[PDB]
């Protein structure tokens, strides 16, 4: 029942910027916080940060800082994630990812690909 | 209309047996 | 809940069994086996605790 | 931080026999708090085992996980020809947790 619908596909420019939403439904967006994952095509997974969607308090990763902004919009049940000055090896399918009967791994969104 | 209930809705208080007793 | 932080923050499943004693007949008990009752004698006896 | 390396990367094997996948930490991970993932091709990441030993909803058990501290295990009893996946182990302890790279296994 819980299903959750991303944006499509992006081909940009490098130096460029990107946002990426991901729609919820099925379940309460605020009493899950949401986490994102990137995934380069070959290699493997690396988590790249977390926001929570009752207060909205921050903790983004060291190698990704100073880039990386989600923002959640509790009304229309709505998470966002904005990136900018993207590079070249950063082209990945990024993920959406609320835990839900689990620590992790629950609802990973169906991707989105950001081609730089 | 009212009227006066006289002497009604005792019950048993506590579903403890007791027998020749006065208890409070 | 953090389950990055320190240990005395982490979530516990608390459980708290509340007791009514003496409030109605005792339904709800331990496996202990039954015997015979013997009658005219004093003996120690445990009925329904 | 704490790195992971699964040393078969890619493991030949006829469907009905035994495999072993092995996935170590750096510093030491509490057993509790880790978790396994099975990555079909085309589809999202799959919790195959979460606490190092305790499988999710759904999981056959022909798999089932183990290990504690650094040094972790994932077995395979029985290959059937729809396991053919690739799998990542990923433990979060303390701070940023870390994915692993997968393990393919081929008929």
């Known amino acids: 029942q819980v299903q959750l619908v991303q944006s499509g596909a992006e081909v940009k420019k490098p130096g460029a910027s990107v946002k990426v939403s991901c729609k919820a439904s099925?379940?309460?967006?605020?009493?899950?916080?949401i986490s994102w994952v990137r995934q380069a095509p070959g290699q493997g997974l690396e988590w790249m940060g977390w926001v929570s969607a009752y207060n909205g308090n921050t903790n983004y990763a060291q190698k990704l800082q100073g880039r990386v902004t989600m923002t959640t919009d509790t009304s229309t049940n709505t998470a966002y994630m904005e990136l900018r000055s993207l590079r070249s090896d950063d082209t990945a399918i990024y993920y959406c990812?609320?835990?839900?009967?689990?620590?992790?791994?629950?609802?990973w969104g169906q991707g989105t690909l950001v081609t730089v | 209309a009212y009227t006066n209930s006289f002497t009604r809705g005792v019950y048993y208080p506590d579903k403890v047996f007791r027998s020749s007793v006065l208890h409070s | 809940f953090q389950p990055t932080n320190g240990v005395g923050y982490q979530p516990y499943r608390v459980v708290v069994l509340s007791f009514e004693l003496l409030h109605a007949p005792a339904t709800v008990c331990g496996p202990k086996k039954s015997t015979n009752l013997v009658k005219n004698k004093c003996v120690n006896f445990n009925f329904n605790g | 931080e704490i790195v992971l390396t699964q040393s078969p990367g890619t493991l030949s094997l006829s469907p009905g026999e035994r495999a072993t996948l092995s996935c170590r930490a750096s510093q030491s991970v509490s057993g509790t708090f880790l978790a396994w993932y099975q990555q079909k091709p085309g589809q999202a990441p799959r919790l195959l085992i979460s606490?190092?030993?305790s499988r999710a909803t759904g999981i056959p058990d022909r798999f089932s996980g183990s290990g504690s501290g650094t040094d972790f295990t994932l077995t395979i009893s029985r290959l059937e020809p729809e396991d053919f996946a690739v799998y990542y182990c990923?433990?979060?302890?303390?701070?940023?947790?870390?994915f692993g790279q997968g393990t393919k296994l081929e008929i």
């Open positions: 990923q433990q979060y302890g303390s701070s940023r947790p870390t």
């Open positions: 099925g379940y309460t967006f605020t009493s899950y916080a």
């Open positions: 606490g190092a030993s």
């Open positions: 990812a609320i835990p839900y009967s689990s620590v992790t791994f629950d609802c």
